[PDB]
DNA sequence: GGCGCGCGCGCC
DNA sequence: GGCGCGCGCGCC
């Protein structure tokens, strides 16, 4: 609701997303917790640099994240706020699968995930991902992709959502998700 | 009392 | 940030 002073923890450079808005994603934190912010505005990037303190007014707050529009006001401010170490650590860490299983649809998920299997289709790709807590599926709609991922590689997800599909709970790409394939290193020939 | 879960922290 | 480990609380 009212203006909120937050400390910026992470922010990617803007990329073109879908109408056809240029946007970016950031992670910010108060003294108690962190949340991810989708900033529609793009102009706002110069204010979203890690460790800077910003005051944000006129924003939307949904079930999981915070939306910052061109109607919003982002003002750089000097603050004595300090983010506790573990709030930063949790803000930045990749959630476990067993933890993800019990989150509402629309919950924003970012992180780095080991993939065991890739079910390919010209309209979607399903990535079997795994950790020690379970297995899960990551649904990326509409690509070959150009990011060809083999087993043993990793996928870096930005702004995916927990999703229900009938029986199973997966991770779903949205229109403004970012997806990247992180390839396992090739042993070389001296 | 046992144990799982969330959380914190230290080592890599 | 990943990973492993201990602590405390709440449910059984």
Swiss-Prot record:
Keywords: Cytoplasm, DNA damage, DNA-binding, Immunity, Inflammasome, Inflammatory response, Innate immunity, Nucleus, Tumor suppressor. This is Interferon-inducible protein AIM2. Self-associates; forms homooligomers in response to cytosolic double-stranded DNA (dsDNA) and the dsDNA seems to serve as oligomerization platform. Component of AIM2 inflammasome, which consists of a signal sensor component (AIM2), an adapter (PYCARD/ASC), which recruits an effector pro-inflammatory caspase (CASP1). Interacts (via pyrin domain) with PYCARD/ASC (via pyrin domain); interaction is direct. Component of the AIM2 PANoptosome complex, a multiprotein complex that drives inflammatory cell death (PANoptosis). Interacts with EIF2AK2/PKR. Interacts with MAPRE1. Sensor component of the AIM2 inflammasome, which mediates inflammasome activation in response to the presence of double-stranded DNA (dsDNA) in the cytosol, leading to subsequent pyroptosis. Inflammasomes are supramolecular complexes that assemble in the cytosol in response to pathogens and other damage-associated signals and play critical roles in innate immunity and inflammation. Acts as a recognition receptor (PRR): specifically recognizes and binds dsDNA in the cytosol, and mediates the formation of the inflammasome polymeric complex composed of AIM2, CASP1 and PYCARD/ASC. One of its GO terms (molecular function) is pattern recognition receptor activity. One of its GO terms (biological process) is cellular response to xenobiotic stimulus. It is found in: Cytoplasm; Inflammasome; Nucleus. Expressed in developing neurons. Highly expressed in regulatory T-cells (Treg). Induction: By TGF-beta. Degraded via selective autophagy following interaction with TRIM11. Belongs to the HIN-200 family. GO terms for cellular component: AIM2 inflammasome complex; cytoplasm; cytosol; mitochondrion; nucleoplasm; nucleus; site of double-strand break. Residues 2-182 form the HIN-200 domain. Disruption phenotype: Mice display defects in neuronal morphology and changes in behavior, characterized by lower locomotor activity, anxiety and reduced auditory fear memory. Mice are protected from pyroptosis of intestinal epithelial cells caused by acute ionizing and subsequent intestinal damage: in contrast to wild-type mice, crypts of Aim2-deficient mice maintain their integrity. Mice develop more tumors in the colon in the azoxymethane and dextran sulfate sodium model of colorectal cancer. The pyrin domain mediates homotypic interaction with PYCARD/ASC. The HIN-200 domain mediates dsDNA binding via electrostatic interactions. Inactive in absence of double-stranded DNA (dsDNA). Homooligomerizes upon binding to dsDNA, dsDNA serving as an oligomerization platform. AIM2 requires large dsDNA to generate a structural template that couples dsDNA ligand-binding and homooligomerization. Homooligomerization is followed by recruitment of PYCARD/ASC to initiate speck formation (nucleation). AIM2 and PYCARD/ASC homooligomer filaments assemble bidirectionally and the recognition between AIM2 and PYCARD/ASC oligomers occurs in a head-to-tail manner. It comes from Mus musculus (Mouse).
């Amino acid at each position: 609701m009212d203006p909120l002073v937050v400390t910026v923890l992470k922010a990617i450079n803007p990329f073109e997303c879908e109408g056809r808005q240029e946007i970016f994603h950031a992670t910010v934190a108060t003294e108690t917790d962190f949340f991810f912010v989708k900033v529609l505005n793009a102009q706002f990037k110069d204010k979203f640099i890690p460790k800077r303190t910003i005051k944000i007014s006129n924003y939307l707050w949904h079930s999981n994240f915070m939306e910052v529009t061109s109607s919003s006001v982002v003002v750089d401010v000097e603050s004595n706020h300090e983010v506790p170490n573990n709030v930063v650590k949790r803000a930045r860490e990749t959630p476990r699968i067993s933890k993800l299983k019990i989150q509402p649809c629309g919950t924003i998920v970012n992180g780095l995930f080991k993939v065991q299997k890739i079910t390919e289709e010209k309209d979607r790709v399903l990535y079997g991902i795994h950790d020690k807590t379970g297995t899960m599926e990551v649904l990326v709609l509409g690509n070959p992709s150009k990011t060809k991922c083999e087993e043993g590689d990793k996928i870096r997800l930005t702004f995916f959502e927990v999703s229900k599909n009938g029986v199973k709970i997966q991770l779903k790409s949205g229109p403004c998700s970012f997806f990247k394939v992180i390839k396992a290193a090739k042993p070389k020939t001296d």
